């Protein structure tokens, strides 16, 4: 494919926008992959693998309950407490979620919009595909900031997360 490359990792595969390149940056425990846009590193895709005692992704609860448990993925947060400050995520809204079964395996698909507190109202769409297989939790997160999301990056970001498949 001209628009995407096929990436096969340790027990998973996905499509990645073909103009993106690998990054050594690792934000999350168990992160095994990062690819990003050369021009805007906020357009990126990450894969995380961790041990779990769960047998299926649905044992984490609903997609929102799952997100609650893995919201470290969204980055540092701010909770708007009483005051007398950083670029932390201040809002996080699930726009869409679903629980597709594909080739016999159950996935969660979650679309999250995050924004920082004040500042430039820098928003990100963070798209999560997650599943459990062979005693491990597999998470793929693709994202773009507002500037790229509305200037051509959307199709590729959505495809990256949607294409995530675990053997």
Question: Could you provide a short overview of the structure?
Answer:
This protein is mainly beta and 167 residues long. Helix content is 13%, strand content 44%.
Total strand segments: 11
CATH first level: Alpha Beta
The quaternary organization reads as monomer
CATH architectural grouping = 3-Layer(aba) Sandwich
CATH superfamily: Mog1/PsbP, alpha/beta/alpha sandwich
**Helical region count?**
3
Q: Under CATH, the topology is which?
A: Protein Transport Mog1p, Chain A
Q: What's the story with the biggest beta sheet? A: 8 strands, antiparallel
Shape designation? globular
- Residue share in β-strands: 35-45%
Outline the structure in words:
The protein is mainly β and 167 residues long. The protein has one domain: Mog1/PsbP, alpha/beta/alpha sandwich (Protein Transport Mog1p, Chain A), CATH 3.40.1000. It is 13% helix and 44% strand. It has three helices and eleven strands. The strands form two sheets. Strands 3, 4, 5, 6, 7, 8, 9 and 10 form an eight-stranded antiparallel beta sheet that branches. It has a three-stranded antiparallel beta sheet with strand order 1-2-11. A hairpin with a 2-residue loop joins strand 7 and strand 8. The two termini are 21 Å apart.
Structural key phrases:
three-stranded antiparallel beta sheet; Protein Transport Mog1p, Chain A; mainly beta; 167 residues; 13% helix
